[PDB]
Amino acid sequence: VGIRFCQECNNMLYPKEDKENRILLYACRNCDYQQEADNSCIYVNKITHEVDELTQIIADVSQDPTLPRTEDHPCQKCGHKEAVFFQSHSARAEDAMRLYYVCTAPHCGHRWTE
């Protein structure tokens, strides 16, 4: 799923398979340098793409004044009552309806979902 660059020309390492050692190794084409891949995975594709939005939410949204704030749900690792919440901004998840909470503390930046 990831992308790796070789050390010679810093170019794409397309997946290549050898018939002698029977090991998948990421090999560059223009340069003869080739490196083995330990993941043994070429790529993945989530058709439903139900990726958690917590990683996508940025912690710097706490200072936003337009975002609504609710004190009902406090931060897990802070205890601060104030917590900014909002709905998913991703168009893919627009079909679903959910709330994502972020701690209002200046430096915490914790994101959690109920």
């Binding site: 337009t66 609504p68 909002f86 709905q87 679903a96 309806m97 709330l99 109920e114």
Partner: protein
Amino acid sequence: AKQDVIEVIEKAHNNELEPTPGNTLRQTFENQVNRILNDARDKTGSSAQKSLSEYNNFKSMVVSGAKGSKINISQVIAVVGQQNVEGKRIPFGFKHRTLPHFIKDDYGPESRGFVENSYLAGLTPTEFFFHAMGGREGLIDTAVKTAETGY
């Protein structure tokens, strides 16, 4: 109706609401909220019709059926009703908010254009713009309707 809409919003917020098999969650929520607001206008509007006395001039027009309609009296006395745009509620022109005053991702009655004030009482500043948006669609449809129908 306003409290019921909040309850529906809370159910969807907590994922308690279950979508119908023939619709998705986002569309199902828009359907449930529309019926609550639509039913309130009809129920309050119907009560307004019974409110008018025989001597009342508003009742005389509708009773004879000459001019006006029971809906017109409802918007004058009971409530104007929801201001739908393009067949749906007011869209989020700004970032997830209909207007700057409303908080982000606000799906409440006032935020989405539900006009709870009758013409006699007077509309709030937010409702006025939402009413204008609904009226603008009708004027555009009327302008093109005559051109197409005449053809």
